[PDB]
């Protein structure tokens, strides 16, 4: 698995049980793996190992997590940033991934937010 961790703020990307999403810098948590996987030829979806959820970008911004594999929203773009940074970007909505100094998890359209700068590194 990897790990999807906010550059800025140092906080991994997490998927709880009960489908909400939030940052965490407990390291030690099962639930901030992820795998990555194809979504057709040019995109990505991001899964929970442990629960088998995927990350999703509401319209309204707000992050979850679903197993609803039919929802357009849980299709990602990763863009290298530089040096080794990425943002996650919701195709659907356009969207860039957020983790917030207060462990929040949202959508940005804001391309210059620094809290939307990720490392993904193996575990
Ligand atoms: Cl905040």
Known sequence: PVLLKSTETGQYLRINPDG???????????HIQFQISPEGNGEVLLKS???GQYLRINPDGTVD?????SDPH??????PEGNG???LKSTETGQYLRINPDGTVDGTRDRSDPHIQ????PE
């Not at 909400?20 to 099962?30: K, L, Q």
């Not at 990720?118 to 590194?121: D, E, G, V």
């Open 85 to 87: 940074e990425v943002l």
């Open 74 to 79: 849980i299709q990602f773009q990763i863009s």
């Open 49 to 51: 190992t442990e629960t």
């Open 20 to 30: 909400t999403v939030d940052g965490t810098r407990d390291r030690s948590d099962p």
């Open 65 to 69: 997590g679903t197993r609803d594999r």
């Open 118 to 121: 990720f490392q993904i590194s």
